[PDB]
Amino acid sequence: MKIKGVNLGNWLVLEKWMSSAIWEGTDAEDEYYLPRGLDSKVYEARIKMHRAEYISERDFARIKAMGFNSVRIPIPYFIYGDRAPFIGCIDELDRAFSWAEKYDLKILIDLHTVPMSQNGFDNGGLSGVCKWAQIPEEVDFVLNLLEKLAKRYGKRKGLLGIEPINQPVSEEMWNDMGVQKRYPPLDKEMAEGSAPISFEWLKGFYDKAADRILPNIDDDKYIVFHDGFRLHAWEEYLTQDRYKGRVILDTHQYLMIAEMLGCEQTLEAYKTFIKEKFEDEITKVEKYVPVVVGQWCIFNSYCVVSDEEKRKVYMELSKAQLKAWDSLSGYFYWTYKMLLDPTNQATWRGWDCWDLAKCVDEGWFPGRVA
Amino acid sequence: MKIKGVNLGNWLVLEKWMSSAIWEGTDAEDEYYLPRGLDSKVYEARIKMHRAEYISERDFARIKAMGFNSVRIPIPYFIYGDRAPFIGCIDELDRAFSWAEKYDLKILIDLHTVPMSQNGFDNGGLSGVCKWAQIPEEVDFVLNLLEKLAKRYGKRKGLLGIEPINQPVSEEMWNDMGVQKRYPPLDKEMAEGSAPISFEWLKGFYDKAADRILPNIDDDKYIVFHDGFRLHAWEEYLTQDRYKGRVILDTHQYLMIAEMLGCEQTLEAYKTFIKEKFEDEITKVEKYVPVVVGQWCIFNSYCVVSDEEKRKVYMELSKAQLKAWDSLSGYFYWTYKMLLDPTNQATWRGWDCWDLAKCVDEGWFPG
């Protein structure tokens, strides 16, 4: 297994910072409140235009041309069109499968959002609220959704696997990130009582998700479990007989943490950090379960210095991380594409490196990975 | 600078065949009728999303990375926002200039559409109507618009030049192409009296446009005159002393026209046509005036056959035309980007080669 991938962030699951136009004229910060700030016909028009334009067949041709073999697609819980006022997008996912199959790429379906949220992050669609796991109706809704998706795509050549939930927040991450202040909730009463998701509860959900997914996908397909921010917690759970050869652990690792931990802002120090904190630690998990780094990037404060120097640095950080991931089962860069405008929004300078295809065009990431 | 360019078709000037989402739920065939088929708030939402998503900074980075130095940007006559119900797009053009200057690209501003049309083509915004040149008030509107744009951008590092009007239709084109049957007018009364634009009228308009543009652009910038489908008509006009060093002739050349004229649909026949009808003829014009081939592509009916042979044919047609243009002042591929789905909408198989960036990714055009 050598998964070389990109994420399709901000396509079917909106991330406000990655593109401004859909948010114009509203005060919404997240997916949940966007339709509440617009006339229904305007919301529909913007959503449908965004989904048609942001990712299309030509993007799959580009991803293949860069040497990737896989794509991770964040999908929303409302994909089947059964959760008003949100707009379904099963047709978009169907088209993605057709384009992946044309270009000999495989898709990891990533259920990125759930009703009432698994993390309270803005990327989860509902800022500052984290109550999904406390609401059995919505847990059951998600399990039914996962079953439907497995039945729909489980025999497809273009399926790599299914990830039952992105980024279920741990107690440590919930407290350390100060989630409800970092992503302040609009409805304070909706937010009160929110709780992080315990390891034991998550294992129980994973058991049920496996019961819905594994019987309904072909025997070469994978279930991909997010680490729930507990990289080293999963040996006993993921070495169970039912999972042998059928599972991948997804961990998300951002280079920017090096600076917070005191890494010197030189290439030599960043490369040592990548070797020690990323390669050396994560390969310990690879010993007993395949691991993909399902979100990572080259963002760093040093490059936020001439343009030539920042190009040199970005390229070396790309190569150093790619080298680390060669000791694992693979990776998905976060993210393939944004619509950032650092030329005119000067405060976003240093942040366009989260757009992988743009990194390639700037000389910040290798032109080909295979 | 040898001009190595791509067009930004379908960005600010819509062309229905290149993307479907904006037309959903309507039977509009062109720019003019789109707002007539939608609630105003829906039209505005769709136009604004399309313009934000279709072209952005990352596209200028890609164009530079692919080795181009120039973009040709079709703009609509309603760009300043003064022609209801259409939506202005000065901001978009201003952003294009900022991105071009960041990436060391130059912009040819191409006025692609005019009120009541210069060609009756769908790409002119109003199918089957061609009356602009018969309406002095709208000719004047266009002259004022060109003057404003020349003043706004004429001192900018990122400006290559200004093209006063795209594809003003000739008598021969109007007759031979059967424009009004190919692009039938929705409103027969509006279309009544449509007529092609004569060479003598066009030179008169060019004199007026040059008076609005040339005093307002710097000496390293150009007025770019479309040939009006008359490649060889311009020697006397464009060698006047006042135009020396300030002018480029824009000619549009499509390999598929060879098929209409009876060319065999083989690579060898296409290459012969490219050498004899493109290179050998257009280089005669380059001898007396700079020429750019402002729209061209690799579309051919042969490729419409194994994927590998299709790839080799496309790459050879790219290389053969690039070789032809090497003896000219430059070119702009039509077009940079489309949103076709040939996988699911098989009508478009063989047509995605009009998307230059996708050509590069398929190995149909040199990296």
Side-chain angles (χ1 to χ4, degrees):
Chain A
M1 191 178 316
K2 299 292 219 179
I3 295 164
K4 302 183 186 306
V6 298
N7 282 275
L8 305 188
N10 197 39
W11 182 30
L12 308 181
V13 171
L14 297 178
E15 317 248 340
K16 180 164 177 293
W17 78 277
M18 295 190 182
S19 67
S20 63
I22 203 169
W23 308 93
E24 285 309 358
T26 81
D27 206 33
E29 297 300 324
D30 50 33
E31 184 99 58
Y32 184 93
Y33 285 106
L34 181 59
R36 272 98 181 160
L38 297 165
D39 280 5
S40 290
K41 287 67 62 216
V42 171
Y43 176 70
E44 181 192 29
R46 296 191 180 176
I47 288 283
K48 292 293 190 176
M49 288 301 299
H50 170 74
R51 292 172 182 170
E53 300 231 358
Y54 202 80
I55 296 293
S56 65
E57 179 177 319
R58 70 200 304 276
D59 295 297
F60 287 77
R62 179 83 196 111
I63 289 166
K64 183 62 167 195
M66 291 183 295
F68 296 101
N69 53 41
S70 305
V71 180
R72 180 168 179 261
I73 307 184
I75 59 157
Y77 67 84
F78 53 74
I79 186 167
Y80 277 94
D82 52 350
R83 302 294 296 244
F86 308 111
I87 300 180
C89 40
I90 206 79
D91 184 67
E92 282 86 346
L93 187 57
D94 283 348
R95 290 188 197 271
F97 272 81
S98 78
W99 299 327
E101 287 177 353
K102 173 174 178 179
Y103 292 103
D104 296 315
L105 301 170
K106 295 200 188 74
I107 291 169
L108 172 53
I109 301 172
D110 150 40
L111 179 59
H112 209 84
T113 71
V114 298
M116 292 297 286
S117 188
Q118 76 286 43
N119 50 46
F121 305 158
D122 51 11
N123 75 46
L126 180 58
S127 301
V129 180
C130 185
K131 288 183 169 178
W132 169 71
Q134 287 157 279
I135 306 169
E137 179 193 344
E138 301 296 18
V139 180
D140 291 354
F141 177 84
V142 163
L143 291 167
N144 290 338
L145 171 60
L146 289 169
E147 189 180 349
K148 290 193 289 186
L149 293 165
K151 286 177 176 182
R152 192 176 186 91
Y153 300 110
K155 297 171 23 175
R156 292 290 293 267
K157 170 183 159 277
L159 182 69
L160 181 51
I162 298 171
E163 180 164 24
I165 194 170
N166 186 57
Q167 292 182 7
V169 73
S170 63
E171 302 94 334
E172 165 169 340
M173 193 63 28
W174 178 253
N175 293 118
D176 293 352
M177 288 198 77
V179 173
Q180 294 179 315
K181 183 71 185 178
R182 185 176 300 268
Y183 308 106
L186 185 56
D187 187 331
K188 292 189 170 53
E189 295 73 24
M190 182 186 293
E192 54 168 28
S194 294
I197 298 177
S198 68
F199 176 57
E200 291 78 13
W201 189 97
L202 188 59
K203 281 187 300 177
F205 172 69
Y206 283 177
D207 284 340
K208 292 179 180 162
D211 290 343
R212 300 307 184 98
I213 293 164
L214 291 174
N216 293 307
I217 67 182
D218 280 353
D219 281 5
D220 56 339
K221 309 302 184 184
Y222 280 93
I223 189 161
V224 178
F225 288 117
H226 194 269
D227 70 0
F229 304 98
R230 303 178 186 85
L231 174 61
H232 293 289
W234 297 94
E235 183 179 9
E236 180 165 332
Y237 184 74
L238 292 182
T239 61
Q240 295 179 275
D241 181 72
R242 88 189 287 203
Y243 290 143
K244 294 321 297 185
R246 307 305 309 285
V247 296
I248 301 172
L249 185 68
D250 176 21
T251 189
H252 298 175
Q253 301 287 331
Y254 295 142
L255 177 63
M256 47 188 256
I257 69 172
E259 305 154 8
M260 310 193 281
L261 296 165
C263 191
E264 187 175 0
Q265 311 254 105
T266 67
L267 213 32
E268 288 88 356
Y270 277 130
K271 291 157 71 164
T272 303
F273 185 91
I274 291 162
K275 181 78 208 330
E276 293 183 357
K277 183 75 169 105
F278 289 167
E279 188 174 355
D280 285 353
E281 286 298 328
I282 309 167
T283 57
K284 297 183 176 161
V285 180
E286 185 75 26
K287 289 184 182 60
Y288 53 81
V289 62
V291 178
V292 297
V293 180
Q295 302 187 191
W296 67 280
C297 69
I298 66 179
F299 178 83
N300 68 91
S301 287
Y302 184 76
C303 294
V304 176
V305 177
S306 72
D307 282 356
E308 297 90 344
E309 188 178 12
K310 95 183 219 164
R311 173 172 51 76
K312 177 191 68 166
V313 171
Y314 278 135
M315 181 61 89
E316 291 311 306
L317 297 171
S318 290
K319 289 171 174 168
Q321 287 184 95
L322 287 169
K323 175 258 189 291
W325 310 152
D326 197 51
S327 295
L328 308 178
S329 279
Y331 62 81
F332 296 90
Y333 193 95
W334 184 264
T335 192
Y336 166 64
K337 165 173 179 173
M338 301 193 302
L339 293 170
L340 217 67
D341 185 359
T343 293
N344 296 309
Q345 318 210 272
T347 63
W348 286 113
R349 291 172 187 172
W351 293 77
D352 53 333
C353 66
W354 293 85
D355 180 325
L356 182 282
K358 193 178 188 200
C359 286
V360 168
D361 290 332
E362 295 278 15
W364 296 350
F365 185 98
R368 297 251 332 164
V369 290
Chain B
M1 187 184 73
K2 174 55 146 108
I3 295 159
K4 298 182 180 197
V6 296
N7 285 273
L8 308 186
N10 194 43
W11 181 30
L12 307 184
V13 171
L14 295 178
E15 300 195 30
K16 181 167 179 178
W17 79 279
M18 301 188 161
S19 69
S20 61
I22 200 163
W23 309 90
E24 184 283 336
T26 82
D27 63 1
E29 299 286 348
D30 51 40
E31 183 97 61
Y32 184 94
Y33 283 105
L34 182 56
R36 270 95 180 171
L38 297 170
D39 287 351
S40 63
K41 62 192 178 183
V42 171
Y43 176 69
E44 167 187 57
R46 291 193 181 174
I47 289 282
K48 291 290 184 36
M49 290 301 300
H50 173 73
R51 289 176 184 172
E53 299 247 348
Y54 203 81
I55 296 294
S56 69
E57 182 172 324
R58 68 201 306 277
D59 294 295
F60 286 78
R62 181 82 191 120
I63 291 163
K64 187 66 174 188
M66 293 191 294
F68 297 95
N69 58 34
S70 300
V71 295
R72 180 169 179 264
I73 308 184
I75 63 157
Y77 66 85
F78 53 73
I79 182 164
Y80 271 93
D82 55 348
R83 301 296 294 245
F86 304 110
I87 299 173
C89 39
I90 281 294
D91 184 73
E92 281 82 359
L93 188 57
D94 288 343
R95 291 186 192 271
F97 271 83
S98 74
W99 298 325
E101 288 177 351
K102 175 173 173 179
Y103 290 103
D104 292 312
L105 297 170
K106 309 300 179 194
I107 292 168
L108 169 57
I109 301 173
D110 149 42
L111 183 56
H112 213 84
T113 73
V114 298
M116 293 297 282
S117 187
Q118 78 285 40
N119 50 45
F121 304 161
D122 56 359
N123 75 35
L126 179 59
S127 296
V129 179
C130 187
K131 296 167 78 165
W132 169 71
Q134 300 175 53
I135 307 166
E137 175 229 3
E138 299 289 21
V139 177
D140 189 55
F141 178 86
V142 163
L143 290 165
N144 290 338
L145 169 63
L146 292 167
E147 188 175 3
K148 288 187 296 191
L149 295 164
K151 291 176 173 176
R152 187 175 188 82
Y153 301 109
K155 310 308 180 206
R156 290 292 292 273
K157 176 172 182 149
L159 182 68
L160 184 58
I162 298 173
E163 183 163 20
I165 191 171
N166 186 59
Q167 296 174 2
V169 74
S170 66
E171 300 92 343
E172 185 177 7
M173 276 288 290
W174 184 258
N175 299 325
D176 290 355
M177 293 299 166
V179 170
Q180 287 185 300
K181 187 189 166 81
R182 194 176 286 272
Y183 309 107
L186 190 57
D187 184 329
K188 262 68 198 175
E189 281 185 88
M190 178 192 295
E192 179 271 323
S194 294
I197 298 178
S198 74
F199 175 63
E200 289 296 317
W201 191 96
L202 188 59
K203 284 188 292 176
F205 172 71
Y206 285 177
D207 287 341
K208 298 185 279 188
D211 174 71
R212 299 310 185 98
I213 290 165
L214 288 179
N216 294 308
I217 73 180
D218 271 350
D219 289 10
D220 64 318
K221 319 292 190 193
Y222 296 87
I223 191 167
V224 179
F225 291 120
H226 192 270
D227 74 356
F229 301 99
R230 306 178 184 86
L231 175 57
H232 294 286
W234 298 96
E235 186 172 2
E236 179 135 47
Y237 184 75
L238 293 179
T239 60
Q240 296 178 73
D241 292 345
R242 63 192 176 102
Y243 283 147
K244 174 61 176 174
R246 300 283 267 145
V247 295
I248 304 175
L249 183 73
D250 177 21
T251 189
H252 296 179
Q253 299 297 334
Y254 289 156
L255 184 57
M256 79 192 279
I257 299 287
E259 297 173 357
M260 298 178 65
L261 296 163
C263 192
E264 298 300 298
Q265 296 173 7
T266 62
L267 179 55
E268 176 180 24
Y270 290 143
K271 287 179 162 197
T272 298
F273 184 94
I274 290 162
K275 182 61 175 60
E276 298 186 328
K277 192 69 183 173
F278 291 169
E279 185 175 338
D280 286 353
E281 244 183 76
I282 307 167
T283 57
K284 292 176 178 182
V285 180
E286 183 75 29
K287 277 201 64 52
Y288 56 81
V289 63
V291 176
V292 296
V293 181
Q295 301 183 191
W296 66 279
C297 70
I298 66 181
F299 178 83
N300 67 93
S301 292
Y302 183 77
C303 289
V304 177
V305 52
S306 81
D307 277 344
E308 295 63 41
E309 168 160 17
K310 190 171 155 184
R311 176 168 70 60
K312 294 188 227 181
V313 172
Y314 279 137
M315 183 61 85
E316 289 298 325
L317 294 174
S318 291
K319 289 181 177 172
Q321 291 182 90
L322 291 167
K323 183 181 81 150
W325 315 147
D326 190 54
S327 42
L328 306 181
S329 285
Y331 62 80
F332 296 90
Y333 194 94
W334 185 265
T335 190
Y336 167 63
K337 166 174 174 169
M338 300 195 298
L339 290 174
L340 301 190
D341 180 2
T343 296
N344 299 291
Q345 312 307 328
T347 190
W348 296 124
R349 293 182 188 184
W351 294 76
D352 57 338
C353 64
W354 291 88
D355 183 321
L356 183 282
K358 197 183 181 193
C359 289
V360 171
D361 290 327
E362 296 279 13
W364 297 348
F365 184 98

